[PDB]
Amino acid sequence: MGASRLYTLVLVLQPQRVLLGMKKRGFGAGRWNGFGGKVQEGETIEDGARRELQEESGLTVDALHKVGQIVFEFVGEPELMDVHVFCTDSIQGTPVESDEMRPCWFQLDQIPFKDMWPDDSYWFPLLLQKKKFHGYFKFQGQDTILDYTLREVDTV
Numbered sequence: 195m196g197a198s199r200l201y202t203l204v205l206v207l208q209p210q211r212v213l214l215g216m217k218k219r220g221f222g223a224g225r226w227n228g229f230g231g232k233v234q235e236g237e238t239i240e241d242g243a244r245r246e247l248q249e250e251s252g253l254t255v256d257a258l259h260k261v262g263q264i265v266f267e268f269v270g271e272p273e274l275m276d277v278h279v280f281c282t283d284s285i286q287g288t289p290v291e292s293d294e295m296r297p298c299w300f301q302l303d304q305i306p307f308k309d310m311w312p313d314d315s316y317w318f319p320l321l322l323q324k325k326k327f328h329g330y331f332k333f334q335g336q337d338t339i340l341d342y343t344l345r346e347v348d349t350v
């Protein structure tokens with residue numbers, strides 16, 4: 195309940211590896227993550243996903259697929275974060291470093307969960323298993339999960 199703000203998150207997932215970026219500034223700096231950000235006025239959610247992927251990594255894609263939705267609450271912040279998660283295996287181009295992100299490929303048994311947001315350990319396996327999901331995570335600061343829910347869905 196309450197006003198929420200729209201965000202995107204894009205995971206480039208190939209058969210034996212996944213592309214992540216080391217966030218170089220701002221919110222989440224110092225952690226590996228997918229590519230994304232705030233959705234702007236005048237663009238769809240999926241347009242916003244492609245825009246952030248191109249700005250942060252130089253990549254474009256043929257198709258994005260909806261895989262999940264995660265709602266974040268941060269203690270003492272008024273806006274909830276409504277994050278729409280997408281995947282793809284159809285990249286056009288070679289990934290390149292930006293002001294915001296330094297991209298690297300990881301093997302699927304070497305995903306660096308110790309240096310990622312702590313909710314990723316819960317929902318990433320569902321992404322890897324190609325299951326669609328709805329998550330909720332309540333955070334105190336950037337390290338501590340106070341409450342969460344997670345379930346599989348038919349419709350994202």
Ligand SMILES: CCOC(=O)c1ccnc2[nH]ccc12
Nearest residue numbers: 201202203230231277311313
């Ligand atoms: C795209 C904006 O997503 C983020 O703000 C965020 C916050 C907390 N855990 C997270 N895990 C992955 C992303 C993420």
